[PDB]
Each structure stands twice: as C-alpha cells, then as structure tokens.
Design a protein around this ligand. Structure first.
Ligand SMILES: Nc1ncnc2c1ncn2[C@@H]1O[C@H](COP(=O)(O)OP(=O)(O)O)[C@@H](O)[C@H]1OP(=O)(O)O
Lengths: 49, 45, 480
C-alpha cells in the first residue's frame, strides 16, 4: 500500500509520463517481492483511481 | 537526493534541538565546563 | 535527616513538566476528496489561508474556502447555517481545517473572551449539531514555545490549545488535534502542514517551525539535582487572591509559617466568607499582619485602589499569588460564550490587571495557579481548561517582558477525579511549590499519579503518545 501511494504521488508531479515506460521500469528495474499487485488498462483515466 | 536538493536550494537550515528518545540527559548536559557542552542543537537523524 | 531525605524522595517522585520533543518529518500522504477550510474574513486573502488552500489543492484534496465574518463566528447556530449553506450542493467533507484561531482580537460585548476560543467552541458544537463525521483540525500561529528561540506564546491561542486538549478526550472521532504554525506563511511549511493533516493520527499535539517539527510530551523533572538560587523570602506585603477558599487558605498559612511580614488576602466576600475569622486567627497566630479584603479582583478600579489604600506603607508588595476563580463546570454541549466570559473575567482578568497595575513596584515573584486539566485535560472540564492554559502563555509573555512570573500547575489538593490522580497532601504541595520557586522553573507540574491506572485509563479514553518519555507510562502501556 505504501508503494502504491508513493507511486501515485510521484506520478501526480510529472507532466504526462509515458505509461509503457513506467510499465517497463516497474517490471524490470524493481525486485518481484511476495505480495504483488497489477494494473491492466488501456486508457489513461483509470490508472490513477 | 531530491530531498537534499529541495532542502539546499530553498536555503533551509536543518539544525534543531537534541534528540530526546536517545536516553541523553539533555536538560542536564547543557552548561554555557568540566564535562558539559555549550551547544543545544545540531543536525540529527 | 532521614525524615528530610524521605520527604525529598517522595516529593521528587511527583514532579513533572511538559516539553516539545523534536521528531522526524513524516513522509505523509495525499489529501483525499474535499477538505472544508474555515477562515476569518478579517484576514481576507492574506497569508496563511491562501497558502494552505493551495497546499491542499496540490495535495490532491478539494479546497472549500469559507470566509466567516467576525461576529458570525461567535454564534454556534449562525455558524451552523453558514457552514450548511457553504457545504450545500456537494459531498460531505472528509476533514475540516480551522484557521479561526488566527484572529488576534477580543469578543465585542464579552470583552474578556478571545475571538479565537469562542470561534473554536462555536465550530466544534456546530459540527456536533450538523452530525458530520469529518475529523476536525485547528491551526494556530504562535500558540506555544517549543524552545528558547521562539518568542512568547500568546494567551488566546493557548486558551484554544487547552480547550482543544480537553475536548479531544471526550470527542475522539470529531477532534483530531491541533497544529501550531510559525509566524509567517511559507509554501514548504504549508506542504508539511497538509502532510501531517492527512496522516493517520496519534500526533494530535504538534508544532511546526523553520528548524523542524515538534510534538508535545510530558517528562519527569525531579528537583533533587538542580542547584538552588535566590531563596524564598516572603518579605513585605504579599497579596493572595481568594484567600478565604481552600487553596488560598493553604498558601496563606504556608506563607505565614516562615518569614511573612504582611499577608493581604483578597476575596469577593472576605470577612463574610465561611471561616474568615477562624482562618485569620490562626494566620495571625504566626506573627502575620493580616488584613482580609472584600472586593473582586476582576474590575481594574478595585485592584487599583486596593494597591494604593489597603497596602501598608511599611511593607512594599513583593509577591502576588493568584489562586481565585469560579468553578463553572460544564460539558461541551452546554458551553456558551457567557460562561467563558464569567470564568475568564476572574481567571485571566484578575491576573492581567494585577500584573499591569505593577511595573511601578518591584515584585519578588508572581505566581499563577494553573490546573493539571490544562496539561492533560479531563472529561467534563470544558470551561475549566482554557483559563488555566492561558495563564502559562501569560507567564512566558511576562518573562519575555522580564518579570519574575510562574505558572505552577497543580493536581488535586486534599481538600471529581478520584480515578488516577491522588489527592496531594497540603504540606507536600506547599514544599513542592517552595522548592520550585527559587529554582526559577517557568512551568512546573506538581501532580501525584498512579500510572498503573492513570495511563491505561487515559489511553482507553483516547489513544495518545504524550506519555512516552515517562518510563512508568511506557511500562503501564506495554504491560497491557
Ligand atoms: N472574582 C473574584 N475576585 C476575588 N476572589 C474571587 C473571585 N471569584 C472567586 N474568588 C475566590 O475564589 C475562592 C475559591 O474558593 P473555592 O474553594 O470556591 O475554589 P478553590 O478550591 O480553588 O479555592 C473563593 O474563596 C472566592 O472568594 P469568595 O469566597 O469571597 O467568593
């Protein structure tokens, strides 16, 4: 939950980041820990909520 | 590091009183000679 | 020898004070939904309101700027109409932010009540009336002094802090806490403010400054190791307000028992009080020149003429003990500005009038008798706390001006808090005040506590982290 909140705050202060780049960075450059979650949507209006 | 940058760029002075949870006798170890100190604030984590 | 050592041990076992522990700037969270900001219209768009509105704006919350007229803030029902119509046609607020305490002015019609305290009372009971579930936060500027670098704390916001502390212990859900702010408004400080406001809780009593963030806690301050200086000598005339009462009786007989030249007791009734003759007989038995007066200390003219006509010319005034006020108990629902006016007319008006009539005669000391309710807060003490809280801030204001003031906080003297705090014996309390007087302690807290029961009960009434630096408190908390 803290990770999700931190990512939301980080994305709030950014001028229109590329979602595929964020997906690549999250998938590759971060360790896969035990408790996992995923957001799969094709529109940039639901990821924030 | 971004915290460091926004701190230093804003000119903030990050010096405050001694910690109280570390067990120091902060009220007693202040004396502006034998085994005391004359400073009551510094940069602390 | 052994008696003195045992007495000193038992007396230092019941010494306390309040301090401001620095703490790390929390990461915080994001503001959710809509937050209802209420502001005085006297400020208009100046400093803090616009900046905190922006801060909640970029924090993810929805600001609701609610300007309030000075007269409108006093009435609870009118404030209820205003908040309902401002909040109308929209969702309920997640939290309420009160800048009402920022106004440095008195209440017209009730001149000895600050607009800050009346506005805060109106806001809390209006939110009770509306049934809203929004957590309430109240922000103050220059309400407390965390260190010597700070300036003197004002009395009005100190009264607000006392009122909030007592209110929180009986409305945990509505009342979240208070957040002091520095004098000037800055974007970084407001960002930290919205961060702490959005936090989970626990840090109810905090202050923000340029150096960092501090939280109010209680610590033991035993006087065994503190050296003494400027020993106590009640020379000359010594004024004691409310001498006929209980606390006045105890302090008067303590003064007489050793080095008393003249004791000027002041009360509304005086000789007519139930036991004035019996009291003055024993009081003059110790060689004390007693002239019990019959006058109210609230009105300026009465004290002005009493300091001129009733003072002996052979004994200038040295000490002024202020331990007189009306016990107007009242629950948060029944509080009204008139009850606060009549309480503050004596608790604050008498003290400030006595102080102001001085500055022509040197005083050895100027004692003020605050209650432990100001430090802690107890259920039902809605009207009792604010005057006690303002008394300290008056004290630091006087030391800033450079006079020998004291704001001694008292527990329950042995003469409705049977749970927790035990009854202080009179002699022990008098000795504690005696040893605190020469040590120049600006805010001692002489209270007896059994932490087996007090800490757990206080946590059950409301969880808090104020009693963490006291080892007995931590032992009691972690025991359960
Ligand atoms: N406005 C005022 N001016 C002067 N003395 C006052 C006062 N309001 C209250 N007191 C004193 O405050 C004293 C309080 O006694 P009390 O037992 O009611 O409270 P307490 O327990 O703190 O002493 C009373 O003796 C009262 O004097 P009267 O007995 O003459 O009323």
């Amino acid at each position: 939950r803290a990770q999700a909140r931190r990512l939301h705050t980080h994305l709030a202060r950014h001028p229109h980041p590329d979602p595929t780049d964020i997906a690549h960075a999250l998938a590759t450059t971060r360790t896969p820990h035990e408790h996992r979650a995923a957001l799969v949507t094709d529109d940039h209006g639901t990821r924030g909520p | 590091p971004e915290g460091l940058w926004e701190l230093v760029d804003s000119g903030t002075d990050a010096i405050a009183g001694f910690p109280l949870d570390r067990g120091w006798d902060v009220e007693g170890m202040y004396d502006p000679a034998p085994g005391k100190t004359y400073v009551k604030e510094a940069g602390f984590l | 020898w052994r008696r003195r050592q045992r007495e000193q041990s038992a007396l230092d076992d019941l010494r306390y004070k309040v301090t401001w522990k620095p703490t790390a700037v929390a990461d915080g969270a994001s503001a959710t939904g809509t937050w209802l900001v209420v502001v005085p219209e006297s400020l208009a768009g100046g400093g803090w309101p616009v900046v905190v509105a922006r801060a909640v704006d970029q924090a993810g919350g929805r600001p609701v700027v609610l300007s309030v007229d000075a007269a409108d803030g006093a009435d609870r029902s009118r404030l209820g109409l205003r908040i309902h119509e401002a909040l109308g046609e929209g969702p309920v607020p997640d939290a309420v932010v009160s800048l009402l305490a920022l106004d440095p002015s008195a209440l017209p019609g009730l001149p000895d009540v600050p607009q800050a305290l009346a506005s805060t009372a109106a806001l809390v009971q209006a939110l009770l009336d509306l049934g809203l579930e929004a957590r309430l936060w109240c922000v103050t500027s220059g309400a407390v002094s965390v260190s010597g670098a700070d300036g003197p704390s004002a009395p009005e916001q100190a009264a607000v802090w006392g009122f909030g502390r007592v209110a929180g212990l009986e409305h945990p859900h509505l009342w979240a806490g208070l957040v002091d702010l520095p004098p000037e408004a800055d974007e970084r400080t407001a960002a930290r403010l919205v961060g702490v406001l959005a936090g989970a809780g626990g840090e109810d009593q905090v202050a923000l400054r340029s150096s960092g963030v501090f939280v109010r806690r209680l610590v033991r301050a035993p006087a065994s190791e503190v050296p003494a200086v400027r020993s106590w000598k009640p020379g000359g005339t010594v004024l004691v307000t409310g001498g006929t009462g209980g606390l006045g009786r105890q302090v008067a007989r303590w003064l007489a028992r050793g080095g008393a030249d003249h004791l000027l007791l002041v009360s509304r009734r005086g000789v007519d009080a139930p036991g004035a003759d019996e009291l003055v007989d024993e009081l003059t038995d110790l060689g004390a020149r007693v002239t019990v007066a019959a006058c109210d200390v609230a009105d300026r003219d009465a004290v002005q003429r009493l300091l001129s006509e009733q003072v002996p010319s052979d004994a200038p005034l040295t000490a002024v003990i202020h331990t007189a006020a009306v016990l107007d108990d009242g629950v948060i629902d029944s509080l009204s500005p008139e009850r606060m006016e009549q309480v503050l007319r004596v608790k604050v008006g008498g003290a400030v009038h006595l102080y102001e009539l001085t500055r022509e005669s040197d005083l050895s000391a100027f004692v003020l008798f605050s209650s432990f309710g100001s430090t802690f807060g107890l259920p039902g003490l809605g009207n009792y706390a604010p005057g006690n809280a303002a008394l300290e801030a008056l004290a630091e204001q006087w030391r800033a001006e450079g006079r020998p003031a004291t704001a001694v906080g008292w527990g329950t003297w042995a003469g409705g808090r049977t749970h927790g705090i035990h009854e202080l014996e009179p002699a022990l309390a008098t000795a504690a005040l005696e040893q605190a007087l020469e040590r120049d302690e600006s805010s001692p807290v002489i209270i007896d506590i059994d932490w087996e029961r007090f800490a757990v009960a206080f946590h059950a009434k409301r969880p808090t982290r104020g009693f963490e630096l006291v080892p007995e408190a931590q032992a009691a908390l972690e025991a359960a």
